[PDB]
RNA sequence: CUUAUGAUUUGGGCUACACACGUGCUACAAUGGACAAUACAAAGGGCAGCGAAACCGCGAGGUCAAGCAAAUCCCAUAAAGUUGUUCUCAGUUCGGAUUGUAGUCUGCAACUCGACUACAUGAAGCUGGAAUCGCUAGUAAUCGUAGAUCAGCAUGCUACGG
RNA sequence: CUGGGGCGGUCGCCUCCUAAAAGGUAACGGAGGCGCUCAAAGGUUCCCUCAGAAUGGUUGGAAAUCAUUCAUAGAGUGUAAAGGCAUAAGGGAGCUUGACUGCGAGACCUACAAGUCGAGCAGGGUCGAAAGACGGACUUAGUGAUCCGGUGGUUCCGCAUG
């Protein structure tokens, strides 16, 4: 036999390691990343209170197409900033989850830098 | 195949594996070569007519492939003709006392 | 990737009717072939390793991974480093191109009657066939290779016990 | 998939006179003379073998 | 010594080998090598043995009769030589050890364990140290031919001439 | 120094134990190390996870290597031991030189000389998409005052002036 790992649990370990010197304090909050296989999820978390400030997703009805799965990630990064232009448009800390800064996690962050966020 | 020039062809084809004094008769049969063909022989249209007769022969290197496995078959059955290869034994029933040196 | 359909035939024609699986996903599936050659202690064979890394590319057309040592065991001359292995993990269609080649040319050139085993498993679904290098270079004959050798082919599947891995090896295999 | 480290391989049509079990590959980069259309349209340079002519087991 | 220390059988062995000394054979060449021609002997043998001239085989050789129990018939065309063409001075056309292919012949039978020839393969070996041996004329040196043993089998032996 | 003295041994730092659950604490008490090493064994960004155990497999030493499943660290961590550590401080890879300059609030330690840790501030960089991380190695040994001398700098002095 051979046991196939799931890609979420390894990701979780990696993310846990990443997210020990990475925190949001509501003057510089944190957006993290959860891409699954179809949809990219972004979310501004203030790590001090444990209270979020914003939320965006590739499966939400405002941004739901079948474009590339990368241009969908560009639409979500455009979405999380224009909701964070309602409040707290200052610097944030990008949290890559446990994923590389490449492809869909990169296009989520390239889109947020060119749409008002200053990270 | 890889024969040398500047010598006579009755001794030149001997230099490859698988020919000794058959080029005097058997290669001389099919090809219309002569005895005094040096490097200056123009054997390029004659290269084709020797290629047809050497293609039937096992000579150029490929005979040593079959010759090697004939010993390998002979030791695998473990015959007395074959044990003498794997053991320095003269093989063809010779006296293995003092004057048996070329097999060591 | 022509004869990959041999597996796609036997998943639903024999394996659904043998064990009576409840879904097509949990049929036993082969995942990797590693062709780990072995050690060949290179006090001199580091030059024969350059032949041994050349022979295994001709068997399977992927470059081997020259696996080095791990410990400092005495009565053996080796340290950390000292590359004493080679393997190729065959994952994709090169597996089936190697599998649907080898199982027709393994039993004939070995000159064995039965040929491999009736059992070689580890109680989990892994075979680990052992080869004394009597099969390879079937295209260019015994012309330029130098030293006799011995391979090792491991078949890693998603079988669960021995008798389900006997079923995958009963497709043009000889136990 | 990496360029540079791989040797050559192709769909080697194993041209055997007994049923032509052409599901093989390797490094037979030789003269392409006759390529069967049901098989690998490449060199037929596997000219003769004892592969699937007479198995010792399924004799 | 006397149910063996004597017998009788086919099967081994006397032929084994990391080696060490005796005795010889063939050599390490261009006063040679390979191919063509062309001479000249002596001695001895032949009680189903020697077996010609023909053939049929690349050859080792097979098929019958020709002669004969032999100064006549056969073994048997001695060879080195001589004549010509060759290679060119290299472990090259020098020699041919050793291994697979012919299955030739003898013999109940050639695996241990024979004898050649057939195409392959072609190794040591460039005239040998200290030492040591033979030999005073048809002798050293070389060249080939015979016979005894023997169904088959000598690089030995014994005789023979050049 | 010394259970008189001599002889033997010892003399500086590091790590334990003795040490009595803070620190500290002696003996010629019990154990050991050091008088370095590294241009990657430093920096930084990325990935990565071990020993061992079975099991079964051309090498098969039991044990090299391959695969599976268990494996909490039992591995490893330049070097003694003790604390550490899978945030990996362990293991790879890519770029690099922060193994920077000027400082340092504060604190530890302590008879003094010494010794240690530092946020932060400029300066000027490296790595990283970025936040950031970088003032040497997982931490704790690898040394020795002053005086004198050498050498290189130096807007300082230099005897009446230069």
């Amino acid at each position: 036999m051979i046991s196939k790992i799931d890609k979420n649990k390894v990701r979780l370990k990696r993310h846990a390691r990443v997210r020990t010197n990475l925190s949001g304090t509501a003057e510089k909050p944190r957006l993290n990343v959860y891409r699954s296989n179809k949809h990219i999820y972004a979310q501004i978390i203030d790590d001090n209170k444990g209270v979020t400030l914003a939320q965006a997703s590739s499966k939400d009805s405002d941004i739901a197409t079948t474009a590339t799965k990368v241009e969908l990630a560009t639409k979500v990064g455009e979405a999380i900033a224009k909701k964070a232009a309602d409040k707290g448009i200052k610097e944030i800390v990008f949290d890559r989850g446990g994923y590389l800064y490449h492809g869909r996690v990169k296009a989520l962050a390239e889109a947020a830098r060119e749409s008002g966020l200053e990270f | 195949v890889d024969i040398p020039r500047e010598k006579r062809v009755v001794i030149s084809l001997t230099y490859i594996y698988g020919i000794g004094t058959s080029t005097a008769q058997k290669i001389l049969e099919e090809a219309n070569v002569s005895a005094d063909t040096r490097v200056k022989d123009l054997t390029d249209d004659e290269l084709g007519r020797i290629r047809e007769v050497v293609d039937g022969y096992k000579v150029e290197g490929d005979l040593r492939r079959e010759t090697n496995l004939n010993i390998k078959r002979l030791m695998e059955i473990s015959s007395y003709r074959g044990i003498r290869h794997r053991r320095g034994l003269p093989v063809r029933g010779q006296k293995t006392k003092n004057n048996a040196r070329t097999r060591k | 990737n022509r004869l990959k359909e041999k597996f796609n035939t036997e998943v639903t024609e024999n394996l659904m009717k043998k064990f009576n699986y409840s879904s097509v996903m949990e049929v036993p599936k082969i995942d990797k072939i590693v062709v780990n050659m072995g050690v060949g202690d290179a006090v001199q064979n580091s030059k024969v390793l350059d032949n041994a890394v050349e022979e295994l590319e001709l068997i399977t057309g992927q470059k081997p991974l020259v696996t080095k040592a791990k410990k400092s065991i005495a009565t053996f001359r080796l340290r950390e480093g000292m590359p004493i292995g080679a393997k190729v993990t065959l994952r994709g269609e090169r597996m089936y191109e190697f599998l649907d080649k080898l199982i027709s040319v393994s039993l004939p050139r070995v000159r064995d009657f039965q040929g491999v085993s009736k059992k070689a498993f580890d109680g989990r679904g892994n075979y680990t066939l052992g080869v004394k290098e009597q099969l390879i270079f079937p295209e260019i004959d015994y012309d330029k290779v130098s030293k006799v050798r011995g391979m090792d082919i491991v078949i890693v599947t998603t079988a669960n016990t021995d008798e389900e891995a006997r079923e995958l090896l009963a497709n043009f295999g000889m136990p | 998939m990496k360029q540079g480290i791989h040797p050559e391989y192709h769909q080697v049509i194993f041209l055997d006179t007994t049923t032509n079990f052409k599901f093989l590959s390797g490094s037979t980069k030789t003269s392409s003379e006759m390529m069967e259309w049901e098989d690998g349209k490449e060199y037929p340079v596997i000219r003769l073998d004892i592969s699937s002519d007479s198995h010792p087991f399924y004799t």
Side-chain angles (χ1 to χ4, degrees), chain A residues 1-59 61 64 66-70 72-77 79-88 90 92-117 119, chain B residues 1 3-4 6-10 12-25 27-29 31 34-35 44 46-51 53-54 56-58 61-63 65-74 77-83 85 88-94 96-97 100-102 104, chain C residues 3-12 14-16 19-35 37-75 77-81 83-109 114-171 173-175, chain D residues 1-10 16-18 26 32 37-40 44 50 52-56:
Chain A
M1 68 182 290
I2 191 166
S3 67
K4 293 182 181 180
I5 55 97
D6 57 347
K7 298 174 178 65
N8 203 42
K9 296 211 274 261
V10 181
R11 201 278 306 197
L12 268 211
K13 275 171 183 320
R14 219 186 279 115
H15 171 33
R17 286 187 176 199
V18 147
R19 203 214 160 250
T20 183
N21 298 319
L22 206 295
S23 292
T25 55
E27 289 89 8
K28 190 181 259 75
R30 170 178 63 87
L31 72 88
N32 57 6
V33 172
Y34 177 71
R35 56 98 177 268
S36 63
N37 282 321
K38 295 181 182 180
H39 302 288
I40 179 75
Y41 298 175
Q43 185 180 359
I44 305 285
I45 293 100
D46 170 70
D47 288 323
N48 193 4
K49 274 81 70 181
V51 173
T52 189
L53 276 76
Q55 192 275 337
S57 174
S58 177
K59 71 175 187 179
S61 64
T66 67
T68 57
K69 205 192 293 184
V70 165
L72 287 174
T74 304
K75 291 180 184 292
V76 176
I80 196 67
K82 301 288 104 173
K83 291 184 283 188
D86 294 335
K87 84 290 287 180
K90 274 75 179 171
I92 53 99
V93 191
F94 185 76
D95 194 0
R96 63 189 179 95
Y99 305 106
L100 281 172
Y101 188 79
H102 182 77
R104 299 188 286 125
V105 182
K106 182 176 180 181
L108 187 66
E110 295 293 330
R113 290 188 179 96
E114 293 293 326
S115 62
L117 293 175
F119 71 102
Chain B
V1 176
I3 60 170
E6 65 95 25
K7 285 180 261 74
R8 294 176 68 186
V9 293
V10 297
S12 180
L13 280 77
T14 311
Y15 284 97
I16 67 169
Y17 189 83
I19 291 172
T21 66
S22 66
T23 181
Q25 296 298 109
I27 305 300
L28 191 275
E29 188 269 331
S34 66
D44 55 354
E46 288 85 3
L47 184 62
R49 68 185 68 188
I50 61 99
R51 190 260 185 275
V53 68
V54 78
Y57 291 163
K58 198 68 181 294
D62 293 331
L63 183 62
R65 182 181 62 84
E66 187 179 2
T67 306
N68 195 2
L69 59 90
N70 286 317
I71 302 169
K72 184 71 175 178
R73 183 186 65 83
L74 190 65
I77 308 169
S78 69
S79 67
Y80 185 76
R81 191 70 63 87
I83 294 299
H85 288 89
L89 267 294
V91 182
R92 290 182 180 178
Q94 295 179 357
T96 60
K97 292 180 74 69
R101 184 59 60 193
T102 191
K104 288 184 179 180
Chain C
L3 197 57
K4 189 262 185 183
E5 288 291 330
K6 180 176 171 65
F7 178 71
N8 201 5
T9 300
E10 299 295 321
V11 289
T12 186
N14 198 2
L15 290 173
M16 296 299 288
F19 190 76
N20 292 318
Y21 297 107
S22 63
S23 179
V24 75
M25 287 293 107
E26 54 106 17
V27 297
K29 184 177 174 67
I30 178 168
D31 277 340
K32 60 182 178 181
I33 298 297
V34 57
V35 291
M37 178 182 68
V39 179
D41 194 4
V43 298
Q44 184 61 42
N45 291 318
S46 181
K47 186 178 288 295
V48 181
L49 192 275
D50 189 77
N51 285 317
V53 77
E54 197 272 331
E55 293 177 352
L56 204 151
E57 287 182 351
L58 296 174
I59 306 165
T60 64
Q62 297 178 357
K63 186 177 72 65
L65 182 67
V66 279
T67 63
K68 291 94 168 67
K70 297 182 186 294
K71 300 297 289 183
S72 296
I73 304 168
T75 323
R77 301 284 77 77
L78 80 168
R79 296 175 67 247
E80 286 188 353
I84 45 96
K87 74 180 182 68
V88 171
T89 301
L90 296 165
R91 293 281 183 180
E93 293 88 4
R94 292 296 298 162
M95 173 196 294
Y96 292 146
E97 192 70 27
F98 178 76
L99 195 277
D100 290 330
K101 178 176 88 273
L102 187 63
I103 62 182
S104 63
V105 300
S106 65
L107 178 60
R109 296 293 183 186
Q114 191 270 333
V116 281
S117 67
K118 288 186 172 69
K119 61 175 176 63
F121 290 149
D122 54 354
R124 274 79 52 88
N126 307 118
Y127 186 70
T128 70
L129 200 153
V131 178
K132 63 176 183 180
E133 197 263 330
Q134 298 294 323
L135 311 176
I136 71 162
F137 49 95
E139 302 169 354
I140 298 170
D141 289 329
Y142 183 75
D143 290 331
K144 67 184 290 184
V145 296
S146 66
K147 177 64 177 67
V148 298
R149 194 56 182 164
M151 301 298 109
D152 181 75
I153 284 90
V154 177
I155 300 169
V156 180
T157 61
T158 63
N160 296 321
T161 184
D162 58 353
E163 63 182 357
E164 290 184 353
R166 295 181 188 274
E167 291 170 349
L168 288 171
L169 271 293
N171 292 318
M174 279 73 72
Chain D
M1 294 297 170
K2 190 185 288 183
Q3 184 62 258
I5 61 170
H6 289 90
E8 193 273 334
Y9 64 92
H10 64 277
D16 188 73
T17 189
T18 63
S32 179
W37 185 258
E38 75 274 12
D39 290 333
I50 57 169
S52 183
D53 58 355
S54 178
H55 292 83

